[PDB]
Write a protein that binds this ligand. Sequence first.
Ligand SMILES: CC(C)CCC[C@@H](C)[C@H]1CC[C@H]2[C@@H]3CC=C4C[C@@H](O)CC[C@]4(C)[C@H]3CC[C@]12C
Ligand SMILES: CC(C)CCC[C@@H](C)[C@H]1CC[C@H]2[C@@H]3CC=C4C[C@@H](O)CC[C@]4(C)[C@H]3CC[C@]12C
Length: 137
Amino acid sequence: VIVTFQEQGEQEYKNCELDKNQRQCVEYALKARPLRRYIPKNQHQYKVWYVVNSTYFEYLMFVLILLNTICLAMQHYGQSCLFKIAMNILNMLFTGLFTVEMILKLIAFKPKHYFCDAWNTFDALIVVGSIVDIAIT
Ligand SMILES: CC(C)CCC[C@@H](C)[C@H]1CC[C@H]2[C@@H]3CC=C4C[C@@H](O)CC[C@]4(C)[C@H]3CC[C@]12C
Ligand SMILES: CC(C)CCC[C@@H](C)[C@H]1CC[C@H]2[C@@H]3CC=C4C[C@@H](O)CC[C@]4(C)[C@H]3CC[C@]12C
C-alpha cells in the first residue's frame, strides 16, 4: 500500500496550480455540453410523456415477481399441482404486465432514440425471453 502511495502522489506532488481538486474541477467541468430536449411535443397523441412518477409505484411491482421467484421454494423435493399452476399464472400475468408497460412507454417515446438507453434494450430482451418461455410451453 505504501508503494501505491509513493507511485501515485509523485505524479503531481508539486501542484504549481490552484489545487488538485480545484484544478481537476476547472479542467474537467468546462467541457460541458447541455442537452436541448429529448421529448417531442406532439401533444395531440403523446399524453404518455408527461406521465411520470408511476414507475416509483411499479418499482414495487419489480419486487412482487421476485417473491414469485421464491414461491418455488414450496416445490422442495415435491410439488402441489394447484400451487404450481398458480405460480405459472402469476408468471404469465407479470410478463404480460411488463410487456404492456414497455409497449405503452415505447409506443410514443421516439423509437428512433429508444435504442440509446441500454436499459430499454435489456427490458426488450427480458420481455422477448418471457414471450419465448410462454410460447414454448
Ligand atoms: C414435506 C416437505 C416437502 C415440506 C413441505 C412444506 C414446505 C414445502 C414449505 C412449508 C413452509 C415453507 C416456507 C415458509 C416461509 C418461507 C420464507 C420465504 O421468505 C421463502 C420461502 C419459505 C422458506 C417457505 C418455503 C417452503 C416451505 C418450507
Ligand atoms: C392439496 C392441499 C394440501 C392444498 C395444497 C395447496 C395449498 C397449500 C396452496 C395452493 C395455492 C396457495 C395460495 C396461492 C397464493 C397465495 C397468495 C399469497 O399472497 C398468500 C398465500 C396464498 C393464499 C397461498 C396459500 C397456500 C395455497 C392455498
